[PDB]
Amino acid sequence: GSTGPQTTCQAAMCEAGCKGLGKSMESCQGDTCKCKA
Secondary structure: OOEEEOOOOOOHHHHHHHHHHOOEEEEOOOOOEEEEO
């Protein structure tokens, strides 16, 4: 829905879409990119 958990540490495309919207960037939490979208 809002926060989307992936399976990736060095996640530049996940974090650049999350910062282009302007929200919050949570990569390498346990091999996981949580983008707030």
